[PDB]
């Protein structure tokens, strides 16, 4: 039922010391969609550079070949025509628009009025649709926004509710939420807009992202974001391997992920990204199954290991 | 207010490929108690071997020298006179007794009746007190016990409530709990025995140990167990560095831990244990602060880093 958006390729490209070659990104994207069976993959950020543009084009060429074109998403910005033009040239068909989700961010970075910014936003979305794209919208810094400026947040969502978008992403951008706060923030919007597909996007700064995600599910979220091995800036994103296992074992919700591919996915990302994981890393660590009286539902063969 | 028991030295000694020399254990114990300022340290398991016996003796010699003798705890077993004699010779003054906390474990491993086992337990506790020791008791496999055999659990705690012990530990031994389940299990006992000092002991198998701990605090726990870098078997224990930060920032409870020593503690354990942590490891990872609009309460100087 729940959709899973992997952001390993986009955020990983942001991680210190990490840079995937075109072949590597292609290899990883293919595995995530076909083997792990994640619903969608966010593979790059618009306007980063050519080559990246080239990488996305090569990935889209393949995607067409497999009828997976709409499962690839590109993170973009409210920059007029730039992001949309870039994506148009890339061959990608889905834009994940980064919009200021807190009054504080809007004012301090853009110095624009909510109405003025909402207008810039409407321009991008309309132009995107004109250009043959579908749009998902990130409420950047939402975790601070609903706690310090809930009015702005409500007006933003209200504006977007009138727009022709596919989903609204609720990101704990700076990773400052507790599970309680997450349920509250999510519940606050899902009740007001019961007809909108919201997805929660956690960050692991306090090692609370999977727990926050579970509460997000409790509040009515229809999707969740995560990355393999938590790859990403700072403390990274919600760890996909642990998120999926926890959803399957500790919640009454489901995912389309093939658990058996989880181990190889982690190994793939670790080698290609060059970012080592610890041996005790939940579900995927080398020593995680070592030690029937002491048996957990977390068995090695379940994730394609030890057989 | 909340007490913190570090189990890095005891559980780490159990971790695959890990073995601390006497000097290393001494160095680490000293840092944990004097610098990080954790309340107590569980440094070894009784009867493991001589040398370990020697290591504990050397550590106690030092402890006396600093008036810290009672802050060192030794994990022991219901084995008659063996564990107590071992601890007596070690110089340690506190026993953390491992007792079967689930009917399933009791029957499958000991094949004894609750009354028969409770008698073995009373023998150890009495002999321990006779030997000049203080006792804390672990309800091993409690996380499965209160969910699959709450009657046995209640009778066990009832028996222990009549015993002269210092605290009762509620361990999620196999690391199978969700935060909701943790609050329920803990709340169930704290209400029946409001005059007992319970502590929650989480395991990170689902990357839910810090979240479970927060709920444990909510249910009335007076202490929590954790280890540096989550060192320990399988997925390890609740990560001390993240647990403390989360308690301080996301709960109204407090800890005596000196946050500024957190980074060096992690580096110390990583080098001596030989178990690498990932660069994105919450609060302590190398890239955790890299990337004032995007600033978290999690600053480098707060944990003794970047200055
Ligand atoms: Zn993010
Ligand atoms: Zn344990």
From Swiss-Prot, chains A, B:
Catalytic activity entry: pyruvate + acetyl-CoA + H2O = (3R)-citramalate + CoA + H(+)
UniProt domain Pyruvate carboxyltransferase: residue ranges: 2-263
Free-text comment on this protein's domains from its UniProt entry: Contains a catalytic N-terminal domain and a C-terminal regulatory domain, linked together by a flexible region. The catalytic domain consists of a TIM barrel flanked by an extended C-terminal region. The active site is located at the center of the TIM barrel near the C-terminal ends of the beta-strands and is composed of conserved residues of the beta-strands of one subunit and the C-terminal region of the other.
Record protein name field: (R)-citramalate synthase CimA
Source organism per UniProt: Leptospira interrogans serogroup Icterohaemorrhagiae serovar Lai (strain 56601)
Organismal lineage: Bacteria, Pseudomonadati, Spirochaetota, Spirochaetia, Leptospirales
Effect of residue 75 to V: 3.3-fold increase in Km for pyruvate and 10.1-fold decrease in kcat
Domain of life: Bacteria
Activity's thermal dependence: Optimum temperature is 35-40 degrees Celsius.
């Amino acid at each position: 039922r729940l959709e899973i958006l992997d952001v390993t390729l986009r955020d990983g490209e942001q991680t210190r010391g990490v840079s995937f070659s075109t072949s590597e990104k292609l290899n990883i994207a293919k595995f995530l969609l076909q083997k792990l069976n994640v619903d969608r993959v966010e593979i790059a950020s618009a306007r980063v550079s050519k080559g990246e543009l080239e990488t996305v084009q090569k990935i889209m060429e393949w995607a067409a070949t497999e009828q997976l074109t709409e499962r690839i998403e590109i993170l973009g910005f409210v920059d007029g025509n730039k992001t949309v033009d870039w994506i148009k040239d890339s061959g990608a068909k889905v834009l994940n628009l980064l919009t200021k989700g807190s009054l504080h961010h809007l004012e301090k970075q853009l110095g624009k009025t909510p109405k003025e910014f909402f207008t810039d936003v409407s321009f991008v979305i309309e132009y995107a649709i004109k250009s043959g794209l579908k749009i998902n919208v990130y409420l950047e810094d939402w975790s601070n926004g609903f706690r310090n400026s809930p009015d702005y947040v409500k007006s933003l969502v209200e504006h977007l509710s009138k727009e022709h978008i596919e989903r609204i992403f609720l990101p704990d951008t700076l990773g400052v939420l507790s599970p309680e706060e997450t349920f509250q923030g999510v519940d606050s919007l899902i009740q007001k807009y019961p007809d909108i597909h919201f997805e929660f996007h956690g960050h692991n700064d306090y090692d609370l992202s999977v727990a926050n995600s579970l509460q997000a599910i409790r509040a009515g979220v229809k999707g969740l974001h995560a990355s393999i091995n938590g790859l990403g800036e700072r403390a990274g994103n919600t760890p996909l391997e642990a998120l999926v296992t926890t959803i399957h074992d500790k919640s009454n919700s489901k995912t389309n992920i093939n658990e058996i591919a989880i181990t190889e996915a982690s190994r793939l990302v670790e080698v290609f990204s060059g970012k080592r994981i610890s041996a005790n890393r939940p579900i995927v660590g080398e020593d995680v199954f070592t030690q029937n009286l002491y048996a957990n539902p977390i068995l090695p063969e379940r994730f394609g290991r030890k057989r």
